[PDB]
């Protein structure tokens, strides 16, 4: 397990605005949703 | 391949003169069907018909008793064996 803390404001902007788990809800392969409920859900 | 199974218990009815005798790859006698043969099973309640398409093996005999879900027909590397 690796945890990285962005230091510069340029890196913090990219993390919040590009890599967050809600603007990437679609996979690039065919455009399917990524976080579909599974198993006990 | 596809296996045709008997949908009911009963007695198989068909004309053995419309089909060609053959030996299967399992060593059993059977019939080769090159036409649309009409095979009848007379069950305990009604009489039921199964259509046998051409190029298919008929594994049962006329007047034979068959059980439900029993295979009655089949719709249709170099290895070395030591004994």
């Amino acid at each position: 397990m690796a945890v990285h803390v962005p230091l510069s404001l340029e890196a913090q902007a990219e993390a919040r605005l590009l890599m967050f788990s809600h603007m990437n809800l679609l996979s690039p392969a065919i455009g399917d949703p990524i976080s579909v409920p599974t198993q006990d859900m | 391949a596809e296996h045709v199974r008997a949908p009911y218990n009963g007695k198989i009815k068909f004309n053995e003169d419309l089909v060609h005798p053959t030996r299967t790859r399992h060593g059993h006698p059977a019939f080769l069907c090159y036409i649309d043969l009409s095979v009848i099973i007379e069950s305990e309640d009604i009489i039921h018909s199964v259509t046998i398409p051409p190029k298919s093996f008929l594994l049962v005999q006329n007047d034979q008793y068959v059980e439900s879900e029993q295979v009655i027909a089949e719709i249709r590397e170099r290895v070395r064996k030591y004994i």
Partner: protein, 83 residues
């Protein structure tokens, strides 16, 4: 006593690292198109025919492997690689 005689991912790697019908047409087109057309037309048109045919078959072969496994990928991504 007796002897009888009786009768995916690597496929993608084979295609991407580089069909009999493709090889006979490329050989066929190479030995004839230059004999028909002149300067910068025999090579130009011959290269277009080979490349267009190759791209169509390469994408089909790649998508044949993934679609048989139930994997859905847009042709955009494969066309970028094949380009």
């Amino acid at each position: 006593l007796v002897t009888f005689i009786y009768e995916g991912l690597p496929k993608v790697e084979q295609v991407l690292e580089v069909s009999l019908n493709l090889e006979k047409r490329i050989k066929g087109w190479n030995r004839c198109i230059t004999r028909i057309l002149g300067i910068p037309w025999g090579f130009l048109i011959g290269a277009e025919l080979t490349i267009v045919q190759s791209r169509i078959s390469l994408v089909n072969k790649i998508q044949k492997v993934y679609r048989s496994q139930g994997v859905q990928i847009h042709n955009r991504h494969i066309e970028i690689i094949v380009r």
